[PDB]
């Protein structure tokens, strides 16, 4: 039916985290 | 009714983002300087015109992209897409440093149109248009800075290309070649500025430790009912302890809130002033007593000298590959060095 | 009920569907050699 | 390299696992 | 390096040290869940 | 009996300026280093900053204006040594080494220090809640960065800040060309705190004069609208909530009163705490972000950036503060 | 309308895991395939230069700068 | 030089005795509220 | 006994992964808790065990 | 029970402060915090020894937890050559697996547990208002510390000893047989003046007086324990402090920042208890060591030395605001008016030598994303030394804890006075003082 916000928001969270990380692992290389 | 009266009607109505008249002017120009700015800093370099890469393509980090400005051999021109240095050729276009000329007009005409926002939704809503006389000051300044001073200068080359490394060379550029701090129009800025953060956090701070208690909850921010009529916080308990404390205190709930719109909004405009005074040179450089003492005593030294060699050593060892079109070869011999003095 | 394509939807997408694109074409330049 | 990712993403899905689980459950969570 | 048996946990020690700071995500996607009452 | 007397003096509410016991501290201190810093601005001798025997004069009788004039921090002989007026053989030597520098800077950030306590007694004395001179150590942190922490971390009170305005200056060029400072991202976070707090401060202004309820007539000044301690709220916080929601969007607008003072508070406070822990953490050579060379192309040549051109005007203000 | 119940729904997120990863490819394969330097005209890490002279191809001329880039262009 | 490093000593112990006695001296009961 | 002492370390591992996602798991969840202890008390005396085990391995190795 | 707003009066940010009238959860909140603490301890240990290369010096590997393992002797030998990594694993390895318990005490304790302890127990069961019980376990805990504290006297004494760094040679792991037990000595230091030549309790410089100094803080430390359980608070200190576990917190707060800046500049100046082979040279070490061998080169091909403020002989130029600097590899060259010329001439050893070029090299100078030398240098050297990471870090958290003291000690006596939720429109006090004016 609905999804739960909370599960919304910590993949969103996530993807967030992994984006930057990803910039930051270019930027070291 | 007519057509006219129809349109309005649905220009204001109420939405989740209010559109208005002004909308018109405000979010198409608003929406395409944010994306040139982005487009620009993701794919666009600065190769052509500063000799810089500027692009995240060209492996550039987020401090380190910019916009950049057009060439200097470009003058003032505004650079138009279909304009005789483009020919509507896109990627010329953006070789050249029209994006800049993009963002920058673009920009100017947004900010015109989130003033006339400010103006219309005041209008509406039934309250005085402050909020628009305020935002005179940012739009002061942004029209100082972006369009006056390269205005008043060769080019759209010495303005503050949109980034964040570029608007710090800006800075060290308006240090070492104007002497900027040492301006009095500038330093009514940083008053206004660094009052106007002071303001902010004592205002807060003094609100939100003069608190009535209206709940019995630890945390007092749901005590608060925004259609209540009383005050929230004590104003004879916070002008007791900063008469105490400080000397002086607000009395008037009224006055200190049209001081905090009155300080940085001065202070920018003041500041507006001196950047237009540098867009013609007319510098706070020096003083002329002091030079005259230091060139007949060779003793004499303060730290006002000191800086000036400071900006000497700024101009020269950043003029070359800050101004290559100028073509500047300075042998190493003729740097100022300070064991050389 | 609720209609679907409004304002709030064309400025939503105007900021969205670009912010992805450039998300995707900047991970593409992470995978670059320099 | 696939193997350092690969565990951190298990840890980091672990934790929310935690929380997923105890939410199903219906537990003192 | 590490003692020579202990050479397939590798990875696993190097997101070692990164776990005490989920521990404070962990809170508040434990606070999501019961929506910050 | 006397001393039960003194204590009710000293912690008494009805003084016009409150004392309290951070006050019998703070007063001696701050009005030594007042004393010190109005006859060393106007008539101290010039100060051997460096060993070099070549001094800087700061004094307004030696020739400076009021943009010119500092006083002079102590010399770089002396380091960190504590440098009172009895540790020199003469009061003119003390004067050549610039110890009125190190008496003014520990008297004020003595005095200072005790003005935060002090604004906490007062809170307590009349009730209120304690927070303010949280708030104050955001300013103080960054009085201590500059006068403190960094001549610690460098090894001389030779490299404090100047008390002057054209000393300040030189601080700051002087820290930018060692520390590149700008691209430090919590001196970015310092510019975000001051901006944001003048940019907050204009705002809340405007807001709330924009709403201000209507009491007078043109032919007065609107200020009479209000009066001291009236119990009524002066302004529509409504109405101002809905003009700042209709131009952004309304859950970008407080509809609390306290959250949104809380805000501002919370705000320029934070972010100079971290330019003031910048300073402190570049006073142990922990330094801005260096983009140097981080471009090159296929054949090695290094295409600059604009972080490059930041380097070069670095490296000329480097080589021109030196010897 | 509101946004949380919009993105709590599982249709909004049907389309979506179809959009977003399409607009996601889209701007990776602008970059990987080398369209974007034709585009905007950004040069590519072994075109900033030419063959031997390391001159930057900076614009002298405002009403021919486009032919002065052309000409550079022409060069590599 | 000396007889003013008894002086400043004299000064600095008389505020600091001064501070220490007096929140030694039953402060938390100097509140309008409670004690 | 390499083998078996990396055996051992990878049944820790597993055992404590187990543990880390399955006794908070059900603490917080207090129905038909009698089975959950023993299952609580077997998996530390397990883990505990497997620690030693894993420590005189490596000094077997 | 106590887990929302209007049941406890706190929002979910200020959720911890739930805890306070619980003692069993704010015991399991502690233990699996000290899980936490433990777990980083281990788990960097070991990500730290996955990537340490033993011939490498440490300080030049981004290292900070394996060095203060060296410094207690473990794993290395002379001139702090490591000559065994195997100690470093079983310290991360006991730290995780330790922690691995501490964290199943304090789940267990924060969920399973009984949420107060005053019904179960009489002994673990306290009031924050009891008195009698806070210094009780203030007692137990300063016999704890002081345990503690004669842990280190017996791995220095007893089981190995401590890297000397000022050992002959270049330093050596030594065992510690006469400490400096005289309290005259011990606490000159403590009443030693914290600016430049004297540098208060930093200044130490040997590990006699360490040794000396952390038996007297045992058995100092056990002594305040013993005091602590056998006595109730005097009257004086019941009208003193507030009595509360803010104010606690609040009291405890302070003394961290304190300590966290002491720790900042001990790291910073110290290269005794923090030697220069492990954490590298101080900032005044590296100087004096580029001083020492621009003098060395120059006199190999008088251009480096001054007089200093009080008559010694000391390096010459910007290195002179570091003429305080001592250091094993230069305190053989200085004599009794300072540097002697005919030292620095045909009395230095290779290994000083060495050391002064290493440490020259390696000047306490770097950038945020790890980059060496001055800000003007190009991205070339990736290092910045352990000694500027530990000394910002710890500014940074005994700043902040300052304002956490700040905080909590304004709330705690606000909150015993009873005016933490706001002024009483009721009665509001400055209405009824008299006006100012
Ligand atoms: C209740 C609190 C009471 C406080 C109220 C006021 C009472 C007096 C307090 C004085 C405060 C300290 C200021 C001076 C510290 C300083 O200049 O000196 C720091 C000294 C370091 O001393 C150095 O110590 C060195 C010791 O090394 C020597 O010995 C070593 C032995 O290995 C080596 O051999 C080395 O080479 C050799 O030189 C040298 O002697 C140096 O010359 C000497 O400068 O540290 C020390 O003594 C210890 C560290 C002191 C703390 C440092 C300041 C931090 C404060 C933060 C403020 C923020 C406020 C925020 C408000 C909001
Ligand atoms: C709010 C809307 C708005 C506004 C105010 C602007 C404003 C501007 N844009 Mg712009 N733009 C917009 C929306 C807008 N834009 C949109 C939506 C797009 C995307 C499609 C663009 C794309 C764009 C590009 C690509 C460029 C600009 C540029 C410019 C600048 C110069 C424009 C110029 O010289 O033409 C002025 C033209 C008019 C004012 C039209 C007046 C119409 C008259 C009054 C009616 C009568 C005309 C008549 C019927 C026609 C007869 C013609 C016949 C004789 C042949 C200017 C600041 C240029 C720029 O920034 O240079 C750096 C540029 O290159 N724009
Ligand atoms: C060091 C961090 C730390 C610690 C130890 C705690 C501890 C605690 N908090 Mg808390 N909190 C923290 C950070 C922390 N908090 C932060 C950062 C916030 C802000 C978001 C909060 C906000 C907050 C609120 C709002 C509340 C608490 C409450 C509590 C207490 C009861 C929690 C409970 O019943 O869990 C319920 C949750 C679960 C059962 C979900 C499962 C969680 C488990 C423990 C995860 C364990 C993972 C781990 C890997 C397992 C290892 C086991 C293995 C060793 C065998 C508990 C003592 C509550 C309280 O005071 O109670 C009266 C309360 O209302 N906290
Ligand atoms: C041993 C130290 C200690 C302890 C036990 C406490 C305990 C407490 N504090 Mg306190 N505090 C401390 C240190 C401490 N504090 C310090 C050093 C400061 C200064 C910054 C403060 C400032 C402070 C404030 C301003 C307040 C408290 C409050 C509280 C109470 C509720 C806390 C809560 O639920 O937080 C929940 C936890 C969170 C919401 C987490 C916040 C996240 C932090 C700020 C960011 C961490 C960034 C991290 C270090 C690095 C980046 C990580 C990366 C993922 C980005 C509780 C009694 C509250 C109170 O008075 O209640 C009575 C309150 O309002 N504290
Ligand atoms: C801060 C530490 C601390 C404190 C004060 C307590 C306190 C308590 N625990 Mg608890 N516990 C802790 C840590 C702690 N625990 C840890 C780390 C674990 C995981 C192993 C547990 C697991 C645990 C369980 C499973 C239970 C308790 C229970 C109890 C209660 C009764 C204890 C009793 O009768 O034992 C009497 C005292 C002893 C048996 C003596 C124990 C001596 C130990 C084993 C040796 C310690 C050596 C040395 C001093 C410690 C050095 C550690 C150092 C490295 C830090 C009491 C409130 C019980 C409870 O609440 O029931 C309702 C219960 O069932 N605890
Ligand atoms: C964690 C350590 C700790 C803590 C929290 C306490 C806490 C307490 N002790 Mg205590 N104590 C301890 C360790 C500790 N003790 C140890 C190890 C010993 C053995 C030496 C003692 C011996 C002891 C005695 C003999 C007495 C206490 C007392 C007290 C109570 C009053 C504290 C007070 O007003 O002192 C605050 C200190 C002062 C008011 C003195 C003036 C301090 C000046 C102003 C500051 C100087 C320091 C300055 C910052 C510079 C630092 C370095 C400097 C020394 C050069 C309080 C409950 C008293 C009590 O009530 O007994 C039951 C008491 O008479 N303690
Ligand atoms: C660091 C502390 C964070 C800011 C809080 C203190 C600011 C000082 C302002 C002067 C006093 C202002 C003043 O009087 O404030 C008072 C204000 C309201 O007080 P209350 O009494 O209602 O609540 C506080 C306690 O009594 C518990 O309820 O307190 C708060 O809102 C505390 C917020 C806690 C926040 C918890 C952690 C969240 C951190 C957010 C920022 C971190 C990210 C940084 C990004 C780079
Ligand atoms: C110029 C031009 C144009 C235009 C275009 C456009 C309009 C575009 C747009 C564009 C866009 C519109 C884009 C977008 C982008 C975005 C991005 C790229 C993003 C990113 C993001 C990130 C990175 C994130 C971040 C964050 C935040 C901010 C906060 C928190 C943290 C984080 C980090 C998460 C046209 C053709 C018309 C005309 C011609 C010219
Ligand atoms: C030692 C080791 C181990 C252990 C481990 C552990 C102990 C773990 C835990 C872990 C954990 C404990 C985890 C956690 C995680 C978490 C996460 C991953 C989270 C995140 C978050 C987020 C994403 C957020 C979001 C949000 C919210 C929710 C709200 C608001 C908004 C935001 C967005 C902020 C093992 C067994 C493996 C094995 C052996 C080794
Ligand atoms: C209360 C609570 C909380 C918290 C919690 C905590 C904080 C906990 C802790 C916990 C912990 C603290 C845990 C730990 C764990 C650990 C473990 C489980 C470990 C394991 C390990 C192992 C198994 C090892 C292995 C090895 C070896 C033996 C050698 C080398 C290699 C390797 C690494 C593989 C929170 C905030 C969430 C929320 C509210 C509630
Ligand atoms: C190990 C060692 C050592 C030793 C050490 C020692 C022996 C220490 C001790 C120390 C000590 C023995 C310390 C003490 C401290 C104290 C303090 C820190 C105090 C505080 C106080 C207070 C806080 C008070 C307050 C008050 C007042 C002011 C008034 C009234 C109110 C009240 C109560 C609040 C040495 C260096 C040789 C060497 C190295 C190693
Ligand atoms: C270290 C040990 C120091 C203990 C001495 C200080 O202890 C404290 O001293 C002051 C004056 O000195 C005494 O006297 C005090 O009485 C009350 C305190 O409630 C005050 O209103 C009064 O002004 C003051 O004279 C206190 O009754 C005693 O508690
Ligand atoms: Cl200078
Ligand atoms: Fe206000």
Redesign the interface.
Known sequence: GRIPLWIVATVAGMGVIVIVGLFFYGAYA | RGWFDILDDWLKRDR???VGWSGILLFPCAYLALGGWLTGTTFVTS?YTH????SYL????F??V?VSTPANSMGHSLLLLWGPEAQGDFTRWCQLGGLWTFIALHGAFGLIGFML??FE??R????????A??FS?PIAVFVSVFLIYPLGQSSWFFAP?F?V??I??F???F??FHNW??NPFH?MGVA???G????????????????FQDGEGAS??R??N???????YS???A???W???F?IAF?????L?????????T??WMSAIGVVGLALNLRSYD?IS?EI?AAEDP??????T??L??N???????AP??QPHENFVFPEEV?????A? | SYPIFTVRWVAVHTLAVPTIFFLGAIAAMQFIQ? | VIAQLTMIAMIGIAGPMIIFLLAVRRGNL | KLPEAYAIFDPLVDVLPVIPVLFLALAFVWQAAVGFR | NL?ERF?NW??S??????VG??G??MI?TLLAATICFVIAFIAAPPVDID?IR?????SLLY???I??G?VVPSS???????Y???E?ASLDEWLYNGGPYQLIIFHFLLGASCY?G???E??????????????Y???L?SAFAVFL?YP??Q??F?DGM?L????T??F???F?????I????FHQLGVA????????????????????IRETTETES??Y??K????????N???????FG??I??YASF?????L?????????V???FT??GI??MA????????????????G?V????????????????????? | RPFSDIITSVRYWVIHSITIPALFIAGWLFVSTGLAYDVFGTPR??S??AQEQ?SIPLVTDRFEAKQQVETFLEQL | ??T??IT?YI?VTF??L??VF??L?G?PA????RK | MTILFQLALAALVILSFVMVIGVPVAYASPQDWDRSKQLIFLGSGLWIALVLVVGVLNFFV | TNRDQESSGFAWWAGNARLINLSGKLLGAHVAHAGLIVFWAGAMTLFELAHFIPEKPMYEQGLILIPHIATLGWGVGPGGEVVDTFPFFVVGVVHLISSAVLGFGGVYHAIRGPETLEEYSSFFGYDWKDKNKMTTILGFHLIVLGIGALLLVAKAMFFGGLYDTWAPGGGDVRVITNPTLDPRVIFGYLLK?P????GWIVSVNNLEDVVGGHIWIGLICIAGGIWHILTTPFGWARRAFIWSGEAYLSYSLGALSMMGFIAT?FV?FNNTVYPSEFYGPT??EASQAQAMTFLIRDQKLGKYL?R??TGEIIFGG?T?????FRGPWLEPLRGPNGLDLNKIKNDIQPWQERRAAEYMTHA??????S?GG??????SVNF?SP???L??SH??LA??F??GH??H???A??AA?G??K???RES???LS??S??
């Not at chain 2, 060209?58 to 980090?61: H, P």
């Not at chain 2, 009395?251 to 006055?255: A, G, L, M, Q, V």
């Not at chain 2, 000497?312 to 950043?318: C, K, V």
């Not at chain 10, 306490?364 to 994303?369: Q, R």
């Open positions: 989740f983002v209010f190769w000799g810089l890469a500027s060209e492996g550039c980090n401090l380190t910019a926002r400010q939704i005041a509406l809503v039934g309250v005085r248009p402050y909020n006389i305020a000051a290309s980034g490394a570029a710090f060379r800075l060290l550029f240090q070492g701090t040492l330093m206004g500025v660094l106007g953060a002071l303001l902010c956090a004592i205002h807060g701070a003094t609100v939100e430790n003069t608190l007092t921010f005590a608060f925004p259609t209540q009529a009383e005050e929230t104003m004879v308990t002008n007791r302890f008469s105490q404390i000397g009395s008037n709930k009224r006055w809130h049209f001081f905090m719109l009155f300080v940085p909004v202070g920018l003083f002091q003492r003793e004499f030294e303060t730290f006002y000191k800086n060699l400071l000497e050593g700024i101009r020269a060892w950043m590959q800050d740097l100022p060095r300070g064991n003095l | 320099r | 001393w204590c000293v912690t509410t009805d003084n016009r300026l409150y016991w951070f019998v501290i001696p060993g070549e001094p800087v004069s700061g020739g400076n204006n943009i010119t500092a770089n002989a002396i380091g960190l040594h504590f009172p007026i009895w020199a935060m002090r604004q906490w007062l809170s307590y004395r009349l009730g209120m809640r304690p927070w303010i001179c949280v708030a150590s955001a300013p942190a922490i610690i971390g090894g001389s030779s100047p002057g305005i054209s000393g200056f030189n700051m060029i002087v930018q060309a060692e520390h590149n700008l691209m430090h991202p705190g001051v901006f944001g707090g003048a940019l907050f401060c204009a705002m809340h202004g405007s807001l709330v004069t924009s709403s201000l609107a200020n609208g209000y001291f301690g009236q119990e009524e709220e002066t302004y916080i409504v109405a101002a909530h809905g003009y209709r131009l969007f309304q509809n609390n009163s306290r959250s003072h809380f805000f501002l508070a919370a705000w320029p406070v972010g100079v705490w003031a822990l402190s953490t142990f050579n922990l330094n801005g972000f260096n983009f140097n060379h981080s471009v090159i192309d296929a054949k040549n295409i600059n950036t604009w972080a490059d051109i930041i380097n070069r005007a670095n490296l000329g203000m480097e080589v021109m503060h030196e010897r | 890490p072994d900033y230069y390391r | 030089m000396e003013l490093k400043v000064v505020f600091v001064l501070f007096g929140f001296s402060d100097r509140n309008p509220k | 003046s600016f430049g030549g004297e500049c910073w900032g005044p001054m200093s403020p910007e002179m605001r570091f003429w305080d306490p100078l770097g950038s945020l994303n980059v001055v800000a003007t240098e190009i991205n910045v000694r500027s990471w000394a910002t500014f940074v700043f902040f300052l304002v700040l905080w000690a304004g709330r006596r606000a006075a005016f933490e706001g002024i009483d509001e006090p400055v003082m008299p100012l004016d």
